[PDB]
Amino acid sequence: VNSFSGYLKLTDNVYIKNADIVEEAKKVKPTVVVNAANVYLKHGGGVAGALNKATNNAMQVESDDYIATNGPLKVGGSCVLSGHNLAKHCLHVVGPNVNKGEDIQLLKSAYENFNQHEVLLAPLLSAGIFGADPIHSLRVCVDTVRTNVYLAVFDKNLYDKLVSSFL
Ligand SMILES: Cc1ccc(S(N)(=O)=O)cc1
Numbered sequence: 489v490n491s492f493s494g495y496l497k498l499t500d501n502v503y504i505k506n507a508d509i510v511e512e513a514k515k516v517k518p519t520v521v522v523n524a525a526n527v528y529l530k531h532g533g534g535v536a537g538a539l540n541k542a543t544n545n546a547m548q549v550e551s552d553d554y555i556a557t558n559g560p561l562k563v564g565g566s567c568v569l570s571g572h573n574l575a576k577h578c579l580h581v582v583g584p585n586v587n588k589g590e591d592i593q594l595l596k597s598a599y600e601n602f603n604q605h606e607v608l609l610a611p612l613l614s615a616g617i618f619g620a621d622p623i624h625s626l627r628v629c630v631d632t633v634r635t636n637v638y639l640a641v642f643d644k645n646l647y648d649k650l651v652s653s654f655l
Pocket of ligand 1: 509535536538616642643
């Protein structure tokens with residue numbers, strides 16, 4: 489049993505909810521929240537900008553030190569950093585950004601990072617300002633992630649479309 493509430497069950501391991509990932513993290517304090525990161529961990533907008541704002545910029549300060557030491561992530565890659573006030577840990581995962589011309593086949597590699605964690609609160613990778621089709625992102629998620637993932641979708645119109653169209 490876990491703390492996650494109000495989710496619709498899509499499969500054995502994937503759950504979905506119309507929820508504000510920031511507000512959900514603040515309520516649950518999950519072991520792992522996933523960030524929709526870029527390779528530079530520049531948390532300007534989208535999910536990343538919202539998560540970072542909720543940490544009062546502490547996520548960005550930590551991230552800048554990580555990049556100064558290790559250099560940029562790979563598209564499809566990840567790193568584990570602090571969850572600050574939102575979670576124990578933040579798994580920063582880089583999905584391909586279609587608005588930069590990145591290979592959508594890298595979305596499966598991105599979701600494979602989730603399998604290193606037994607339970608996660610996450611957004612749909614490469615959705616929103618990363619430009620991918622969220623219906624596709626949900627299909628790759630279901631077909632790739634084997635650990636227990638709780639997906640948060642802020643916009644009701646998209647949430648309702650994801651559920652209604654789910655095979
Ligand atoms: C209308 C809206 C949609 C998505 C988000 S976020 N910060 O989860 O990406 C916020 C507001």
